[PDB]
Design a binder for this molecule. Structure first.
Ligand SMILES: [Mg+2]
Ligand SMILES: [Mg+2]
Ligand SMILES: [Mg+2]
Ligand SMILES: [Mg+2]
Ligand SMILES: [Mg+2]
Ligand SMILES: [Mg+2]
Ligand SMILES: [Mg+2]
Ligand SMILES: [Mg+2]
Lengths: 385, 385, 385, 385
């Protein structure tokens, strides 16, 4: 189960670089130089890395310092063959963003947030990124009167429209991906789920430029089914990027390594991505627990990739098993894929077998055989066949 | 705090008529005749009632029995002045719907579900309903392989497109409202939140015909902020109807009377509906607890309306208080309503006060004054001013 | 992975016998004769069955009808070799119990609940049960003023004390097990978790007679770690019985087959029960989903036992792996088992290496190596070694 | 609604002193001198303050620096009349505690944790504290193999037994209170709820020395009913202290000001504390949101006390209303307080009115009248009577 760069596994600089500061504790690890992270991730078999502006260039850097930070980083990419497929903006750490960036109540903060974003879009394009992610972690509220949400959505649409005007006027070949999260660090965050983000995109001026960047743990913080939400994003043509990690139910954002948390949900996710032919990066947004030293950091990162590859093998074995293929027919998955009424509305209205002469009791007696099918999936996941 | 029919309070026949059967217990109340419910709700000051087909016409009724059930019902409406603003279809009780209606794996069940729906659309229009609600309570799954969600969404879109073709060909003046719910009775339900439903509507052939019917308790079963979701639905122009009740957190669907559950969320909801000028029915989808006899049924229904009227008074007093109006300016709600960059993208890029000369430390030091504002809201809710 | 009666797998009559009625739907399966269930479970390799009084003897049965129902049941046990290790009382289905049994506000209902329980204790002893379970599903409230919880706990203690007086005066060799549940069907249920039940037992007059009957899905409805709670019950010497099933997070009580839901938690549970030497029944309290016909009922029951046996093999392989044993030493699980201060309080106070000369920075730098250990557990669960 | 020191309102130094650093953001406020906090809280009408050792004496302070920090603090207490009723130990911030204090896998860390605690017990007694709180925020795990919970509970019992030996040998008049929390910052925390903590205390060598310090928001992070848990703690005689704040459901620990979050639960809590005659401190463990400047800090602290006093008035008015007193009799709260069987077991067995001649249908038909009672409580809370 050895990863190769062809598997397209990517990691944020902020993931293996997390120093372990949590709301009740100080850092347990020293800071990692971005160049060392790139080198160490390349040896593990990763394809590339991603970054926030402030991960790569310390906040408040002079233009001269900025140029040398980028130059060092580019040299590490050239030495290793790593790519940078995605970049994003930090609009959440600095105190100025305490009430948001794009939807801060203060207008001057909103204009600053846009300029900070635009400057990193230029850098991302220079480094070859294809996707630009926006996680509005500070957009939201702890109390009801603090934020008029209709006005906030007006401001959010205004910001993303301006960003789309900028990339189209510059001729950039980059697309945007909105990352939803239901809560934390704000009491409630705007666009809290995949669904809310997909709905918002359809009101932007150039919807074709925007998709979603869903994260396993974030949808699970609302108790939702992550594979179901990914299926709706794929159905809409909007899965531009994906963040993989693990989460144990409804609680604080744990960012466990992928495969931890809800293991069966991880299996059904990999089954779906591989069956659908998703061709984007398999990106890990995770935190090595602060109990770990640097050896544990790299073990946890390796485990992300290993677990994806194990689940990929088991899902493929499941779908290729002739006994599973007949169980899928026994449960009428083949009929689900067939149109309900390709004969049209009038023919349906005239069809007495659809109502007047439909035997509801005979249809109701037909078992779905879902439990046999699900035990075949369990046996395949566990390697018990 | 006396309701009048001008307040537009409506109730489902199935609400006060719930006999108290739950998954662990038998019914504690006898069945109510729809005619008696209409009479008793009119005396309490309700505006009208809503129904599922099977609430009004017992399943399996002959055409002759059907005509007399409707005739009796219409006479009660004429005697009381009650209206019927909304109707819906039962696609969840009968065993034939155990794997769904519109997205059942069996194609013949899906065609039956469409014919059952179309027949009740005709009845709804005859009784004057303006909105037709769809709650897909059986659309979903308990296990991952049972339902290919991309195929299921294809079938769901096919069903709603056929329904829109039917109403437009018949010249009906009725619109559809999709009611989301995250889970129960299926392990996960398709279109689980307001957001997912809004996103789905934008892929239908005639999106102008479809909106949402959100329910307080359902969004709270995913831990989401119900007033925030309503604000996004209003922003999109899609709040066609609303279901009011109460829910104590993430658990089974409690359907408590409105004002029970999360009281502060009820206050912010009423504030938003009244400020936005929502003019549709204030519909209660609630269950009088099975501890109650019929006197308790009518007390619980009266309490729904009373709590709405109390909260309406307190929210109005909050917004009209000059001290609250200056607190809103102190927290810069006025600036949130002003465009970020009406001067345009180029002017923003050329504005040195937006980045090069922006004083981030001075802006970061400005307090938001949100806690004073929220205590003014608490004082108004509690009548402590 | 074939079960034998030596594995001690047991099932409630109400599990495979569940007809599929849920709060929104009618039954999808016909009722099962208890004699047929006993026969079919014996062929699958079960050890025995459990029952509520009303599962075996329809409510309101004459003494003559009661005798023939028991006689038929006993003959099926004799023909198959099945045992009855546990019995319990239905104090939740009949409308008279709508506000509780032992803690109903009406005193005459509380006395009736005690007499109904005592009559089934006699039957349980006659059939050889060693454990008598109490699930107070109706003990609780939907509103704050309905139930004074201090008075309710007085009544709950009074009921269990009277039951302990009864069994000791009759010379019965049977013990009680309290089954906690946080909510459903009441809005909040008294003694909602394993912890609350353990604490309550220590205030009874004869605490040695009472332990807990925890259920996987119930602790997960509060978001708690089920293996951790089982460990505390074992530590206290109070794990008298256990209910095995599956649950997908915080929502309605799903009662999925064991191994579904949180698969990793099922692995750690089996590891703990087998390591600790738990010798009681492995009881399944689960519902075959109402999508299934009778073939699916028996497939789902077989899957309960199969999943336990697979996890038992993988946990045993994990603990016997020499590489796992050195990883446990690397993470200092051996030091956790050693007393902190067997030298005593005074020696600890005089030990300068414990404070004055303790090198906190060197200790803080030691990694715990927990992520390597957890990936070894994942590899063993998945059969990737 | 003006607080006086007779109301016994207390605040932790770490509450108003929280600088606003969260897991995704830097501090938004400068650090407060403990002496200034004492002065400002005294002017607001607080009774006293509480502290962790490291709040008052920076970690790593020399004995000489330690003496001057305490001397300054004592002078502020003398100048203002503020008391110190509670103190606690920081066993969670420093990296050395990353795997726990009392239950760390490393034995030398566990011995250090005990010595750090004992040194602050001496200081607490010197400053007059009556209660010593222990919050084991780092005791727990993110993965199943990292922590054998039976061994961890052995170590936890060993630590608390040693602490009880220390206070009894020194002749101190101080008692311990264990503060439960279900999760955060560890993935699962040991003793996660009030119930688990009460059960654990009964296995200590001197149980009379230990009680609980429950926190509103912590029990709500498991979806539990906080007034119900407080009632069980009072019933057991173990409510030694209480932490008041607000929480919006199952998510990260919000620590909102008291009265925010679940407002109805706050009403029922105040009703219970006042009815039961709880005479300990009303302690606020809350965080002014990081959106606020120092004016907002003091507004949020004032709001804690104001909301308690408003709810106290409304609960008193509820219980004194003659119409509420007859509604309580209508719902048979008076019968709940009467023994079920003071006549004894034999008389109950001989009572034919309890079973043979009990009319279950007549009893089942009696409504509980709980909804009328709950609307009277709502009207009183809202000042609508
Ligand atoms: Mg995350
Ligand atoms: Mg992410
Ligand atoms: Mg509902
Ligand atoms: Mg509804
Ligand atoms: Mg259950
Ligand atoms: Mg059970
Ligand atoms: Mg807290
Ligand atoms: Mg606390």
């Amino acid at each position: 189960y050895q990863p190769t760069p062809e598997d397209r596994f990517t990691f944020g600089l902020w993931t293996v670089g997390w120093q372990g500061r949590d709301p009740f504790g100080d850092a347990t690890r020293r800071a990692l130089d971005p160049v060392e992270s790139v080198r160490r991730l390349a040896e593990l078999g990763a394809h590339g890395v991603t970054f926030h502006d402030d991960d790569l260039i310390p906040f408040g850097s002079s233009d001269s310092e900025r140029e040398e930070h980028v130059k060092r980083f580019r040299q590490a990419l050239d030495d290793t063959g790593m790519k940078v497929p995605m970049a994003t903006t930090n609009l959440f750490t600095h105190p100025v963003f305490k009430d948001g960036g794009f939807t801060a109540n203060d207008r001057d903060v909103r204009r600053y947030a846009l300029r900070k974003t635009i400057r990193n879009i230029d850098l991302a394009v220079e480094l070859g990124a294809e996707t630009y992610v926006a996680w509005g972690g500070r957009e939201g509220a702890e109390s009801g009167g603090a934020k008029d949400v209709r006005d906030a959505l007006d401001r959010m649409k205004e910001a993303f429209d301006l960003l789309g005007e900028y990339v189209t006027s510059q001729g950039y070949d980059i697309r945007f991906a909105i990352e939803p999260k239901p809560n934390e660090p704000r009491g409630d965050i705007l666009l809290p789920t995949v669904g809310h983000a997909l709905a918002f995109i359809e009101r932007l001026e150039r919807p074709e430029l925007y998709g979603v960047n869903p994260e396993v743990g974030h949808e699970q913080m609302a108790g939702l089914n992550f594979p179901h939400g990914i299926a709706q994003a794929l159905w809409a043509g909007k899965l531009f990027h994906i963040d993989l990690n693990g989460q144990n139910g409804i609680k604080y954002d744990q960012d466990l390594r992928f495969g931890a948390g809800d293991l069966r949900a991880a299996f059904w996710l990999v089954d779906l991505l591989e069956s659908a032919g998703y061709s984007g990066p398999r990106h890990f947004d995770f935190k090595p627990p602060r109990t770990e030293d640097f050896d544990g950091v790299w073990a946890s990162a390796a485990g992300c990739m290993r677990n994806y590859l194990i689940l990929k093998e088991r899902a493929a074995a499941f779908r290729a098993d002739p006994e599973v293929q007949e169980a899928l027919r026994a449960s009428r998955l083949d009929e689900l894929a067939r149109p309900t009424a390709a004969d049209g509305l009038q023919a349906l209205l005239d069809d007495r077998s659809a109502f007047e002469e439909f035997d509801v009791d005979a249809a109701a007696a037909r078992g779905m055989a879902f439990e046999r099918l699900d035990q075949l999936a369990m046996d395949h996941l566990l390697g018990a066949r």
